[PDB]
């Protein structure tokens, strides 16, 4: 497909649960409310 | 409900109505018998009884489980993909019988696509299973 927070279209696009945050990796680009505890 | 699993439904509810149904014809015998009944055969449909291990059992499933048909009823269908393309084997079914088996119930022991008994003939005629075998049963 294509991405909306980059225009790269490569370095892999997440479209799981209707979000993109893997053309800007979510570890760097957090505050989506996710956490790791386990 | 009543039918199946009250006489041992696996092998002692089958052979007795089978004999009776072949002795005096009732159920469908429509062409399509030769065609694949179960997924990815390398053989013919079966050695003998192409569509005569089927029909009463396909009524039985829908009876006791209430209006399982055409997609739910293949739930108690089979398919393993027992020969495969060297990938992980997966389940399937062949739709061929679905059509014919939803036709069936309008005659013989069931009434309609909402009501699946009459006097429940199969049960009553199966009360003589227990009494005496017709196969020389081990347990009788």
């Amino acid at each position: 497909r294509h991405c909306v927070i980059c225009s790269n279209q490569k370095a892999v696009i997440r479209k799981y649960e209707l979000n993109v945050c893997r053309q800007c990796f979510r570890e760097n680009a957090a505050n989506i409310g996710f956490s790791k505890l386990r | 409900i009543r039918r199946i699993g009250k006489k041992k439904g696996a092998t002692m509810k089958d052979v007795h109505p089978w004999r009776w149904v072949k002795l005096c014809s009732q159920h469908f015998k429509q062409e399509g018998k030769l065609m694949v009944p179960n997924c990815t055969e390398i053989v013919k449909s079966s050695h003998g009884r192409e569509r005569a291990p089927q029909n009463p059992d396909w009524y039985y499933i829908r009876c006791a489980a209430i209006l399982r048909a055409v997609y739910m009823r293949p739930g108690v269908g089979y398919g393993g993909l027992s020969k495969r393309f060297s990938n992980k084997k997966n389940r399937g079914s062949r739709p061929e019988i679905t059509v014919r088996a939803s036709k069936g119930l309008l005659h013989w022991g069931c009434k309609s696509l909402t009501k699946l008994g009459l006097i429940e003939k199969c049960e009553s005629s199966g009360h003589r299973i227990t009494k005496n075998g017709r196969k020389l049963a081990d347990a009788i």
Binding site: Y16, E17, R22, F25, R26, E27, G33, F34, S35, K36 | -
Partner: protein, 99 residues
Amino acid sequence: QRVLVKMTSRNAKAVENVMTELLLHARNEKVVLRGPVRLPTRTLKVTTRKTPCGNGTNTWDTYELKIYKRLVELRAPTELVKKITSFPIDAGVDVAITI
């Protein structure tokens, strides 16, 4: 018919301030209160590669959300429901319903 209130939120201790506290106002005060126990809590689980390159040990993560759905039931308020749903303002993603 009977009006129900589902409150869906990411976080506990937002929804808590809604159900317990602000249902007291509707408890027998203007309508009757039938408490069940709230609906099953979904997880949204996502799996993200830690490494930004092909050299690591091929590591991954497990990230999870809680989805709290807090259901309590009432017996047919009409026009009174305006009060009920104006009570919480205390957190974002507090949404309420009327049948």
